[PDB]
Design an enzyme around this catalytic site. Sequence first.
Site, short mmCIF file in Angstrom:
data_model
loop_
_atom_site.label_atom_id
_atom_site.label_comp_id
_atom_site.label_asym_id
_atom_site.label_seq_id
_atom_site.Cartn_x
_atom_site.Cartn_y
_atom_site.Cartn_z
N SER B 115 42.27 35.79 39.19
CA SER B 115 41.00 35.83 39.84
C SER B 115 39.86 35.95 38.80
O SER B 115 38.85 35.21 38.85
CB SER B 115 40.83 37.04 40.80
OG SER B 115 41.75 37.00 41.85
N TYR B 141 44.37 28.39 46.17
CA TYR B 141 44.27 29.84 45.98
C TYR B 141 43.81 30.03 44.54
O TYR B 141 44.57 29.79 43.64
CB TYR B 141 45.60 30.49 46.20
CG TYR B 141 45.50 32.02 46.23
CD1 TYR B 141 45.56 32.79 45.10
CD2 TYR B 141 45.26 32.67 47.45
CE1 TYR B 141 45.39 34.19 45.17
CE2 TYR B 141 45.17 34.06 47.56
CZ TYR B 141 45.15 34.83 46.38
OH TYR B 141 45.03 36.26 46.46
N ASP B 234 44.43 25.12 37.20
CA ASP B 234 44.83 26.53 37.49
C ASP B 234 46.32 26.59 37.49
O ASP B 234 46.96 26.18 38.43
CB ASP B 234 44.27 26.98 38.81
CG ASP B 234 44.66 28.40 39.15
OD1 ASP B 234 45.53 29.00 38.43
OD2 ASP B 234 44.07 28.90 40.14
N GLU B 235 46.89 27.06 36.36
CA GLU B 235 48.31 27.20 36.20
C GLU B 235 48.76 28.69 36.19
O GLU B 235 49.83 29.07 35.65
CB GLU B 235 48.78 26.55 34.90
CG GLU B 235 48.67 25.04 35.02
CD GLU B 235 49.61 24.21 34.16
OE1 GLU B 235 50.55 24.79 33.54
OE2 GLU B 235 49.36 22.96 34.07
N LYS B 237 50.05 30.27 38.69
CA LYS B 237 51.31 30.32 39.34
C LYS B 237 52.46 29.55 38.64
O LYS B 237 53.58 30.07 38.60
CB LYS B 237 51.15 29.78 40.75
CG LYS B 237 52.35 30.04 41.68
CD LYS B 237 52.23 31.37 42.37
CE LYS B 237 53.44 31.62 43.20
NZ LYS B 237 53.15 32.92 43.83
N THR B 291 35.62 46.09 30.05
CA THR B 291 35.94 46.98 28.90
C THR B 291 37.32 46.83 28.28
O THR B 291 37.47 46.80 27.07
CB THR B 291 35.63 48.44 29.26
OG1 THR B 291 34.27 48.53 29.76
CG2 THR B 291 35.75 49.35 28.03
C1 LIG Z 1 32.33 50.64 32.11
C2 LIG Z 1 31.65 50.86 33.40
C3 LIG Z 1 31.90 50.00 34.53
C4 LIG Z 1 32.68 48.77 34.40
O1 LIG Z 1 33.97 48.95 33.97
P1 LIG Z 1 34.73 47.64 33.33
O2 LIG Z 1 36.12 48.08 33.05
O3 LIG Z 1 33.91 47.18 32.10
O4 LIG Z 1 34.71 46.55 34.39
C5 LIG Z 1 31.35 50.40 35.76
N1 LIG Z 1 30.59 51.50 35.94
C6 LIG Z 1 30.20 52.29 34.91
C7 LIG Z 1 29.34 53.46 35.08
C8 LIG Z 1 30.73 52.00 33.59
O5 LIG Z 1 30.46 52.75 32.53
C1 LIG Z 2 48.08 34.35 41.76
C2 LIG Z 2 47.13 33.23 41.62
C3 LIG Z 2 45.74 33.47 41.28
C4 LIG Z 2 45.18 34.82 41.26
O1 LIG Z 2 45.77 35.68 40.36
P1 LIG Z 2 45.55 37.28 40.62
O2 LIG Z 2 46.20 37.96 39.48
O3 LIG Z 2 46.14 37.61 42.02
O4 LIG Z 2 44.06 37.54 40.63
C5 LIG Z 2 44.97 32.34 40.98
N1 LIG Z 2 45.42 31.06 41.02
C6 LIG Z 2 46.66 30.75 41.45
C7 LIG Z 2 47.14 29.37 41.55
C8 LIG Z 2 47.57 31.83 41.76
O5 LIG Z 2 48.83 31.63 42.12
#
Ligand SMILES: *Cc1c(COP(=O)(O)O)cnc(C)c1O
Ligand SMILES: *Cc1c(COP(=O)(O)O)cnc(C)c1O
Lengths: 429, 429
Positions: B115, B141, B234-235, B237, B291
């Site tokens: 995603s 998907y 999108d590979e 899967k 992060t």
């Molecule tokens: C770091 C942070 C996020 C985002 O976390 P990520 O892992 O970078 O997505 C959200 N809220 C606050 C207050 C943060 O410091």
């Molecule tokens: C599983 C899948 C995603 C999404 O992966 P997530 O780790 O669930 O976010 C995207 N594209 C395809 C084709 C998938 O099978």
Amino acid sequence: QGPAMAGNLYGRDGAAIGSLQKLRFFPLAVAGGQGARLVEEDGRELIDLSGAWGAASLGYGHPAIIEAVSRAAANPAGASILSASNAPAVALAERLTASFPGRGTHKVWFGHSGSDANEAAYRAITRATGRTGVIAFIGAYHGCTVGSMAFSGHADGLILLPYPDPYRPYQDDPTGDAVLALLKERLAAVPAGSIAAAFIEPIQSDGGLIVPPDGFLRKFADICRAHGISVVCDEVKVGLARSGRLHCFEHEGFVPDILVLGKGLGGGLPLSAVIAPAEILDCASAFAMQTLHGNPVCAAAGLAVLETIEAENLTTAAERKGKLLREGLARLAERHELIGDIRGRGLACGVELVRNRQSREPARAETAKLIYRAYELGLVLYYVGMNGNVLEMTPPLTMTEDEVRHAVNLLDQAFTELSTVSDTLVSQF
Amino acid sequence: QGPAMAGNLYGRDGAAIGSLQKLRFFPLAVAGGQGARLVEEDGRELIDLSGAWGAASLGYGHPAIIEAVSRAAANPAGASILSASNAPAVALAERLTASFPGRGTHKVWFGHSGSDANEAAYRAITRATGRTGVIAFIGAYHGCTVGSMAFSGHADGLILLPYPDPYRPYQDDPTGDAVLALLKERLAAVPAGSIAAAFIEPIQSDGGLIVPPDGFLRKFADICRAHGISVVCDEVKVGLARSGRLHCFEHEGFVPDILVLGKGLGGGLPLSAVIAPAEILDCASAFAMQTLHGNPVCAAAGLAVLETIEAENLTTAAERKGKLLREGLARLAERHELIGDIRGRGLACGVELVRNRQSREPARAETAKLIYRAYELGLVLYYVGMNGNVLEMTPPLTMTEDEVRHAVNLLDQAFTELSTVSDTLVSQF
Ligand SMILES: *Cc1c(COP(=O)(O)O)cnc(C)c1O
Ligand SMILES: *Cc1c(COP(=O)(O)O)cnc(C)c1O
């Protein structure tokens, strides 16, 4: 720009990794780490006062994280929470809910990141209530995904407020009452019941490590509850022991409706969580899901972090070592006029740099040079803030008293040798 | 609904984890795993023909993943790629780019999930081109975040097409030419140059494991390139050896502009990647970042997966073991009329169930009951598809010939005892 530099780990990173996700301030190139120290490809050691932006809560190579992750990798309870319950994820949810005052009414959703978690909280609350309006703060950092940026300050029906800063008070009002009054006047201009939620940071992170005035957050929470607005406390940055209490809201006299966690929850693995009322998190199924959510290796790491907070008394450590850090910085402020404000709680510390203490004019160029020089001297820290002038210190909670000392000494030298850093070299980043 | 059941791991999952991220078909509750087998809290062993939706590429407790993750946890190169280069992430990007035909021109972006990766690809291409239009398929998907759902089929200027299915051909055209013609007629109705990208799955996943007709994807790619539309494959899967070639597009006579990877790339840790032209991924900085992106533990896992694909000849394994699986299923189809179509490539296999082979009427209720019975018998698999009637098999690539046999035998029994499953019990999920 020669071949040896281009062939080193930093040069290879430039040739293979796109700039899209980079936030680079100096050519830090890491091959290993131990405790609160990073080791570069060339073998040079550095003290990491960033702690990976707060994510390395237990530092590098902590035995609890080694033990947990190796154990789970060798005997993993599947790979996911989506289509199976798994033991470590359930134990983790149990522990997280037990830690929170809404333990009888709340459940948990697991993600990979703070961004993911904030997105899921917003999606769930808007689904549950049928309302999309949301309150957030200017300067707020809630993530860097489309769904988390929709109400960041760094969505349909967004109200954005100034975050009250004791060093630069909105409307010259040190209490923050003027921001509450502004909120009331904004709410008066919208339809009754149209705001679903309020996202707040209990110390504003990217905004400048800004501890709000005494009482403000309690008062804010009361206004929200008077309107049936769910209060979401984003403690991705300052949660889980970092503030010197387990949850940062413990300092502020209120309990949120929803708590968002991330960063150091995984101790260097990707793990996030939302703890919210059951009615919010049970309002849909198959709605906010990613395949590896709740995987046991990351869940095991989160368990290790929670267990180690307990076993190594890390709440109290953060409060003690934060006092020691702040003492050191106060000594630095005797010698270096640039230091305008030292603030924060526990081991979430900000130091704001100004060209003049009376005017509080921000020292933006000086800050960037300072951290570059620190890197050269063997200390890693970054800056943040609306004006680019707040040093951020979020070291591992396990950082020793000796490593705190050494970092303060290295910072003292950086301040002394700021000037030596060339504008061209720094503007490369 | 009694206390013993409520106190078991599945009951505790219900009390502590919200429904928001759940996709549950039967009360699978896992405490451990080894090889291609899951172990429930009560000690019962199951063969996992899902492989965690494809994510457990090397199965459970693979020594390469144990070794890598334990090594990286004990000596981690920091926790992030954002503000430092780190050794494992760079090595991984290098290996991923070397694997791809655009190795001289392409770089890598790292994420936590498919995603995340699809969101980042879309954001980067639209930024780079200044266009937001996008082509995708109905049933596609691409993820379950706001940013990845914007062009899923399961954004401003979205064109959605039917995915050509040899078992149910659009406009009775088995070649898929009618879908290409439709695309041309859609493109004729938009301004020149307004579509930035085309997202395609080279075997449609959630749509029903649908291998497109011979030649179709090459032709599609040619239409895109004639319009300067970037082709994104999108590979997540079906990539990384699962199809019996390293990249699934190798079966299809084209090379995409952008390749998106996830799931099994991390071997059970959260890891994703986008491999794209440098100009796309270098068009901004500090733009799409979380992060823990590029953390060394997850990077180490990805290296282990790539190394193990090589060392255990897993491309060829997938092709061999996929033939064995398909042989077994063909034997099942002699005995069980419900089986209408067996399709896929390598160890991405779909079995479509129909009430009658002439009419191809979907067997939706029967499919749900089938997988519930299989769970009771000790085999884990799920269904997918527009009509809820395609069994999905994506087992670990390391699943042995003996485990393939056992799964086929257990499936044979499930088909025989379908009926025995009560409607009420199954509709609980
Ligand atoms: C770091 C942070 C996020 C985002 O976390 P990520 O892992 O970078 O997505 C959200 N809220 C606050 C207050 C943060 O410091
Ligand atoms: C599983 C899948 C995603 C999404 O992966 P997530 O780790 O669930 O976010 C995207 N594209 C395809 C084709 C998938 O099978």
